Amino acid sequence: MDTFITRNFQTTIIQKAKNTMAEFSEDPELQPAMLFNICVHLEVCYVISDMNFLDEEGKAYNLRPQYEVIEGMPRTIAWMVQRSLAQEHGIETPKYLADLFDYKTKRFIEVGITKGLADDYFWKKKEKLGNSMELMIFSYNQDYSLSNESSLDEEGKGRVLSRLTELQAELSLKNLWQVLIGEGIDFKLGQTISRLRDISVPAGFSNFEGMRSYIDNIDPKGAIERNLARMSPLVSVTPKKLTWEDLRPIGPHIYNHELPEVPYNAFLLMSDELGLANMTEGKSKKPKTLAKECLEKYSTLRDQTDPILIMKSEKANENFLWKLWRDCVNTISNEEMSNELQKTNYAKWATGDGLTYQKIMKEVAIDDETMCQEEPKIPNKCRVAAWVQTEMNLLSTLTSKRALDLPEIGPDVAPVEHVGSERRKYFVNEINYCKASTVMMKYVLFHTSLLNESNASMGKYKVIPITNRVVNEKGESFDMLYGLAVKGQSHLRGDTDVVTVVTFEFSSTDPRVDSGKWPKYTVFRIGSLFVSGREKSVYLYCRVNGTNKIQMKWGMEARRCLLQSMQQMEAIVEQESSIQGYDMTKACFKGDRVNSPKTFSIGTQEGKLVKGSFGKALRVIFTKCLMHYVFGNAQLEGFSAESRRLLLLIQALKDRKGPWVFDLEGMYSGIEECISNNPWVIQSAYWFNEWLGFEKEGSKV
């Protein structure tokens, strides 16, 4: 195979043929028959050209040859050589690339190898090319076909004819002729396609023939400058030098106290969460059994049958929600093995599933004059809410509980592996016990279980516990129950369709200490808890939400926030190391002799900048990623995509790189159109304004 090509042909021809193939890069290794064909073609061309020499005037013996090989070298130079030859000699340049040029007749020639019989491939080539090339064809079986007589003579023909003998004998001897070694197109346009081509020409042309003649006959030199002097001066970029005083705060309306405060709208409680803990031995349990045992450990909360309503949403029915909660509790507490709710008819109306508009045939709908398209729901415009800042503060702190136990990997022997291992160790020692870690794991587990029970259950209205598995420093393992959800079943199974999930989450937070945060939640009081001899009330936050399979998968993949935060950490460390020549992980965490541990600006206290360790910065990065994920929507995506430009402009200002802008108000409007009701977007706008004020202050000095 390849050994045959290596032995039968010299290396230069083989590599030139390989380059010619790579020019037609499809798969230069899968098809070796065409490799053989090309190498044989190049061998024939060389045999033709490597002895037939010429002289200055007419002597067909200095150093000038009568043949120029235009094969085996890249097409970019081959076409230029062909054009130069045609221009110098004044002969028509062929529309196909030539395999060789003969100097005595100063014309391009074509060569080919025919397996079957000569004078047949010759005529096929004549049909292909016509009267632009002189065709010489050599066949595997002794035969030849030429278009003239003053070309290569018998002595040259003998070498080429005998060269094929070895190949044809060895291929047959090696049983490689009946399976390989077996080697112009006419395309016509009809009438409708021709008409479409005729009517698809730019303005000023009648048919496609006129456009074709135009494009390839006129010289367009000077057209761009001709038109630019004709265009209106009003077509301009209007550049302006950016300054610090040009960077006004984004989204001023978030400071208007007449607007409502952003309500909490995440799927699950993050910092107000209260998980009932049941100490276990780490053995894996079914969600229903875990929930049952957790509720048994707290019988007073489980057996609370009367509702003490604390807060109610405007359109929420407290009786429906309480009966749904009791149905979930009774279903999880029973001795059966199914999580389907017992009262399905009641659950149909309690969840609001029965209040769905019925579809009708389009004929009556068209006839009915009272059926109109619904107006889109414009998002409300709200102001800054302190609960977002409180969530940021609380979720970045270290707790006594960790929810991440990743498997092992192989030993590190390469230096890059050691660098990665130390970075990973310092990351885990800082993020393991962060509250955001446990919250992220709770979200991921909830969405995993939500999608798992979204199969062809055909049972509808199941109950899904909101659980987690956690461990502390001492190594003890706890199963935490954060509440229960009831998931409905949509028979319309497309994985983009809303299924209703009614969540009942435990909390120790009084909803009345922050009324503007809980307008979507119906909150009851279900009992009290003693954790360290101190009594804390236990409230049940009930809310009807909706989700589809794609959001369930998105929530499941929310675990990639860990990878995102660690990639950000690695980017920071690598940026620090680029200035230096070594790894700055130790310097960035523990500090070496030449550099003290690095401190980062974390936040403000009474308007004064506060600094902290790299670990606090890493926890802040991780919780920022987690909030970006749990609060993600179109508004957050747009805000993140658009504020990057302002951030980079501010970076250019800081670096004294002399930034210029073409439409600052347009950029500001594009950024601000995304600040409607997303808590994260509004809080990030507030944070951006604060940081921009600090940067303005620091720029003066």
Partner: protein, 634 residues
Amino acid sequence: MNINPYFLFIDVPIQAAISTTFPYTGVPPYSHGTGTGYTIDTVIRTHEYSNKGKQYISDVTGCTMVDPTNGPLPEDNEPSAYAQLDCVLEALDRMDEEHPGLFQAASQNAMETLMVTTVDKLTQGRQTFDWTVCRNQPAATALNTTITSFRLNDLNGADKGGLIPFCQDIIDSLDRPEMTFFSVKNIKKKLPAKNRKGFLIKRIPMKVKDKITKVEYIKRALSLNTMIATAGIQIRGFVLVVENLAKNICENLEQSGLPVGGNEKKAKLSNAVAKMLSNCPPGGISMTVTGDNTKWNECLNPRIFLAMTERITRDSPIWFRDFCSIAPVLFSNKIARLGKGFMITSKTKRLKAQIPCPDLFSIPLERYNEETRAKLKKLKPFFNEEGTASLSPGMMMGMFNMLSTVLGVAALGIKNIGNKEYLWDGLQSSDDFALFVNAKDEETCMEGINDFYRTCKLLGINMSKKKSYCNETGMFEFTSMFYRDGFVSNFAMELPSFGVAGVNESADMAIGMTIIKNNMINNGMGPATAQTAIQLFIADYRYTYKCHRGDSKVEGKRMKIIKELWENTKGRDGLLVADGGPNIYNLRNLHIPEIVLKYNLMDPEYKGRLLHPQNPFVGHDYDAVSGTHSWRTK
């Protein structure tokens, strides 16, 4: 203390601190970019950016056609599609001058590849429109149905295997007075019900033979459905060769950013920055412009692309020029299918109904909301009474990404207007661009940027003033890659998803390790991130295949005997993780199969059992080693 994440930018450069803002690269579940409303919006915008051009009626399909090319020059700063043919031709001629023989070499390579290409190549794409059933189907099934229908119609071109005969027959089919094909109809039919009537009406996926007229077939062949839009099979065969041509040209241009190798992008950006800095005049200033383009696809005209292909294939045989002129020609006569329709609703009666696209104008426009009502008012002139609209100007998707990049680089190749004291170069990446301008003062760099803006307006390229900015050379952004004084970061990164490939325990491991390795080779994943990706994949793999370690305490179906395997094996390190063995993967050995990785550590007994030559499981990309774990599922 109140935590402010943005304060991290005080101590760290923003390029490093903003890296990997988005952990994904695909559309999220909350991506509002599909529906009849958005398709109509695209049509209205495309026709608004070309409303000052010529307007006529197609002699073939009868639709309303708009031609902005060679129209009046813009007198304002809104998106304009009035590209001048002369300017485009001048840009292409200069591009040819700077790279002698490039157009002809690209043309010859594309022609040869076309001659070698087979019909089966029209299967490696994505979901494609299908005229036989008028729906989006995978490329394979759509191609098969088209081939069968053509055989029914006495068009046997694919029997020869070549792509050129198939395209010849696909072009000839446009001339048939009628086209007969096979359609799939959900056929409701009789069934002996247990009820008294004994009629259980039910549907089956039946195949019937249907027939349409030449005009209907021609409109179907020029139609793009909504997935955003997707094209049919009648256009992919011609689009392949035009794209190949553009790729051949683009891979020999120093401005066309096409270094898809991860680190090759970093090298390209660094080399561009260094080359521009080294060419700056002594005492002058070099300024980089990070640019965006507004309505890039809505302002590029297929007529300009047809002229581009004509110019590029100038020295080619007439047959190849004709072959290459078809894709832009079919795209200049395209028809946009507007989708499902609109939902109308009565709140008092709690009723709802879907008005389809053909019946969009069957109800008074006062029963639509304001935005939809205005959209329909503007759409009416370009609306066909079958649920489709005429979209002659603009493009829709990345069908001509490479040709768009060629046009952008041709724009970048002017480098100067009026022999003024500035020189511009840059990088183009198909709607993303960076423009470096060297002059002797900042005020002349601004003049150069303005001249580039106007020149791009002359070619139909509209650069976003609201999203474009500039500073001194040394810091900029290109294709989600931030460059600053050498350091390079990425704004977005597709982190590995949670799951398994879904083939076997043997194939899934190789697939996942290959994904991790390719992520850290092409997307710039760091060491620690890659190691944690390995950890997450191992956890997910063990949880999915229930193959936790044999020394662990976890009960289950397979684990009961995995523990016995662990206890009966002395060389417990050589066990595969699918058998409860340890995970020995790391960064260095991410490209080696785990079977051959642990072969030298495998026990002779376990090595024999696992790799039994005729085990009952296997029977008869990703690196594979045959074994009991390479099983199959029903």
